[PDB]
Structure formats: C-alpha cells, structure tokens
Design a protein around this ligand. Structure first.
Ligand SMILES: [Cl-]
Ligand SMILES: [Cl-]
Length: 162
C-alpha cells in the first residue's frame, strides 16, 4: 500500500464533475475545482486545469494527472509549512502518508489547526492523538474516512486499508 493507493480508496474516481461531501464541485480523484455554487464556474476551472474544452468530462489519464499534481503539492505544502514540517519529519513512513491524506483533504491550514494533536504526534503519544483527533468536525462529517486515517496515524500500519 502507498499514498496513491490510499487516497484513491478514500476519494474514489469520477470522470464527471460532481459535488463533494461538502457540496463543492469536484472531479477525478478528489480534485476540488471550486467552492462557488456555479457549475459554469466549475466548468471554467476544469478546462483551465486540463488545458482544453472538456465540457465537464475528463478521461482517466487526465484524472490521474491531476492526482499526481495534487499529491505532489500536498507533500510540498507540508514541507514548506513551519508547523507541519517538524511533525512530518518526526514520523515513520506510514504515519507520514496519513498526514499527507489529511492535507490533501483539508488543506495545510486545516491540518495546521490540529495543534494539540500535532504536538502529541511529535511526542509519539499515539492513543492520545486518536482521541483528540476524533473531537473534530472533520471526524463528525466523514467518520469512516476519518477513522481510517486516525487508525493509520495511531498504529503506523495499513490495516484500516486492507
Ligand atoms: Cl490545477
Ligand atoms: Cl466517510
């Protein structure tokens, strides 16, 4: 298992513009297009991301291309982030993937808002991190996904995904 397979499971793959769990226009593998309520604005952002007149539909390859870019950006974002970098550096490989998943999903800002958990993560207090992270909108809104991510961070294994 790896970060790509991990996210692919959590996000799925859709070749047509769709609304995410929060109601935002998305496509491919969890690629947020826009927060605006306009399908057109959505269609606009899409063509611009893809480089062609898509008409709200993309191919598998195009989806995977956005995906690659998105994972890369998530990783780079973490590493440039003052609050995230040190956590990341302190973790093992599996747990790192968990942090990338979170950032992919909620943004650097969003993850950066889990201060207390991040600090505990650095201290390697696994059970406490999981408890704390469960106390969040994130967990209440997408519980199954959140549980998978939390288990990963807690245990350091891919069990939640096998
Ligand atoms: Cl883009
Ligand atoms: Cl869920």
């Amino acid at each position: 298992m790896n970060i790509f397979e991990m996210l692919r499971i959590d996000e799925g793959l859709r070749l047509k513009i769709y609304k995410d769990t929060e109601g935002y226009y998305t496509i491919g593998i969890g690629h947020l297009l826009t927060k605006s309520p306009s399908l057109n604005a959505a269609k606009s952002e899409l063509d611009k991301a893809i480089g062609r007149n898509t008409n709200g539909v993309i191919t598998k390859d195009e989806a995977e291309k956005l995906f690659n870019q998105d994972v890369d950006a998530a990783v780079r974002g973490i590493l440039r982030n003052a609050k995230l970098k040190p956590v990341y550096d302190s973790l093992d490989a599996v747990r790192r993937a968990a942090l990338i998943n979170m950032v992919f999903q909620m943004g650097e800002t969003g993850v950066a808002g889990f201060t207390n958990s991040l600090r505990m993560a650095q201290q390697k207090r696994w059970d406490e991190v999981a408890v704390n992270m469960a106390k969040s909108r994130w967990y209440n809104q997408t519980p199954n996904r959140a549980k998978r991510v939390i288990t990963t961070l807690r245990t350091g294994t891919w069990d939640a995904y096998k």
